[PDB]
Motif scaffolding. Structure first.
Motif, mmCIF file in Angstrom:
data_model
loop_
_atom_site.group_PDB
_atom_site.id
_atom_site.type_symbol
_atom_site.label_atom_id
_atom_site.label_comp_id
_atom_site.label_asym_id
_atom_site.label_seq_id
_atom_site.Cartn_x
_atom_site.Cartn_y
_atom_site.Cartn_z
ATOM 1 N N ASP A 74 23.854 62.772 77.790
ATOM 2 C CA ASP A 74 24.943 62.362 76.756
ATOM 3 C C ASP A 74 26.262 62.348 77.999
ATOM 4 O O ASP A 74 26.342 63.217 78.743
ATOM 5 N N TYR A 75 27.012 61.481 77.576
ATOM 6 C CA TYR A 75 28.127 61.125 78.774
ATOM 7 C C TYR A 75 29.717 60.951 77.993
ATOM 8 O O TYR A 75 29.681 60.558 76.755
ATOM 9 N N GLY A 76 30.623 61.787 78.446
ATOM 10 C CA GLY A 76 31.931 61.580 78.170
ATOM 11 C C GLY A 76 32.195 62.433 76.887
ATOM 12 O O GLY A 76 31.948 63.395 76.450
ATOM 13 N N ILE A 77 33.385 62.240 76.629
ATOM 14 C CA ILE A 77 34.448 62.780 75.849
ATOM 15 C C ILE A 77 33.661 62.955 74.321
ATOM 16 O O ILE A 77 33.908 63.773 73.810
ATOM 17 N N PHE A 78 32.861 62.121 73.837
ATOM 18 C CA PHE A 78 32.268 61.884 72.900
ATOM 19 C C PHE A 78 30.728 62.395 72.997
ATOM 20 O O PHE A 78 29.852 62.265 72.086
ATOM 21 N N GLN A 79 30.306 62.411 74.129
ATOM 22 C CA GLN A 79 28.858 62.936 74.617
ATOM 23 C C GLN A 79 27.983 61.821 74.031
ATOM 24 O O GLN A 79 26.907 62.331 73.241
ATOM 25 N N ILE A 80 28.075 60.608 74.193
ATOM 26 C CA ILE A 80 27.142 59.538 73.622
ATOM 27 C C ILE A 80 25.757 59.673 74.635
ATOM 28 O O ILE A 80 25.782 59.457 75.531
ATOM 29 N N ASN A 81 24.778 59.650 73.783
ATOM 30 C CA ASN A 81 23.471 59.536 74.385
ATOM 31 C C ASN A 81 22.898 58.379 75.077
ATOM 32 O O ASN A 81 22.999 57.361 74.551
ATOM 33 N N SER A 82 22.463 58.279 76.302
ATOM 34 C CA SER A 82 21.748 57.356 76.714
ATOM 35 C C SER A 82 20.609 56.523 76.540
ATOM 36 O O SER A 82 20.018 55.383 76.894
ATOM 37 N N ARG A 83 19.875 57.235 75.244
ATOM 38 C CA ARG A 83 18.586 56.594 75.067
ATOM 39 C C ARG A 83 18.866 55.288 74.176
ATOM 40 O O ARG A 83 18.182 54.109 74.041
ATOM 41 N N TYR A 84 20.153 55.318 73.419
ATOM 42 C CA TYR A 84 20.371 54.050 72.794
ATOM 43 C C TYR A 84 21.693 53.472 72.896
ATOM 44 O O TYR A 84 21.863 52.227 72.515
ATOM 45 N N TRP A 85 22.641 54.124 73.469
ATOM 46 C CA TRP A 85 23.904 53.604 73.749
ATOM 47 C C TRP A 85 24.311 53.137 74.940
ATOM 48 O O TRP A 85 25.159 52.018 75.116
ATOM 49 N N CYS A 86 23.924 53.653 76.115
ATOM 50 C CA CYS A 86 24.260 53.096 77.475
ATOM 51 C C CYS A 86 23.312 53.222 78.345
ATOM 52 O O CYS A 86 22.291 53.994 78.401
ATOM 53 N N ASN A 87 23.411 52.405 79.411
ATOM 54 C CA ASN A 87 22.343 52.293 80.416
ATOM 55 C C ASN A 87 22.503 53.155 81.562
ATOM 56 O O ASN A 87 23.679 52.827 82.118
ATOM 57 N N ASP A 88 21.802 53.836 82.049
ATOM 58 C CA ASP A 88 21.923 54.801 83.130
ATOM 59 C C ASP A 88 20.657 54.359 84.086
ATOM 60 O O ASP A 88 20.797 54.936 85.280
ATOM 61 N N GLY A 89 19.884 53.497 83.619
ATOM 62 C CA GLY A 89 18.561 53.349 84.467
ATOM 63 C C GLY A 89 17.413 54.368 84.506
ATOM 64 O O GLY A 89 16.528 54.057 85.124
ATOM 65 N N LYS A 90 17.534 55.586 84.019
ATOM 66 C CA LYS A 90 16.664 56.537 84.164
ATOM 67 C C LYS A 90 16.250 57.222 82.775
ATOM 68 O O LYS A 90 15.751 58.267 83.008
#
Length: 130
Positions: A53-69
């Motif tokens: 989860d990333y940021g002020i809203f803790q948005i998860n990387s599975r569906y929302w943002c690419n972190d490459g891992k």
């Protein structure tokens, strides 16, 4: 950046969050509050499903943002998860909006259902001039 309450409330309002898809500013504030304590560089690794989860809203990387891992993940916000760790929240707000365009709406965040749903959220915006 760790926002001060009212400082953030005006930032969100300025960004068009007030009543976005029927979600009042108070509800957005209550979400940011319980997700990161108004902190943009907040991160939480999920060992179970290997997401983060990333940021002020803790948005998860599975569906929302690419972190490459994150295995088999998608990028619905068309953003690097790094964009959700910026001091400027414009991108995180654009991603947050995309999240609520989905069926669940503001219910996508369990913390919201836990600490904001059917609760008195007036206190988050009082005195902020929003």
């Amino acid at each position: 950046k760790v926002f001060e309450r009212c400082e953030l409330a005006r930032t969100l309002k300025r960004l068009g969050m007030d009543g976005y898809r029927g979600i009042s500013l108070a509800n957005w504030m209550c979400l940011a509050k319980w997700e990161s304590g108004y902190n943009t560089r907040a991160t939480n690794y999920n060992a179970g499903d290997r997401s983060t989860d990333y940021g002020i809203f803790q948005i998860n990387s599975r569906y929302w943002c690419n972190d490459g891992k994150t295995p088999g993940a998608v990028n619905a916000c068309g953003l690097s998860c790094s964009a959700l760790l910026q001091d400027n929240i414009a991108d995180a707000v654009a991603c947050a909006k995309r999240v609520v365009r989905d069926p669940q709406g503001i219910r996508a965040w369990v913390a919201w259902r836990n600490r904001c749903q059917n609760r008195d959220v007036r206190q988050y915006v009082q005195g902020c001039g929003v």
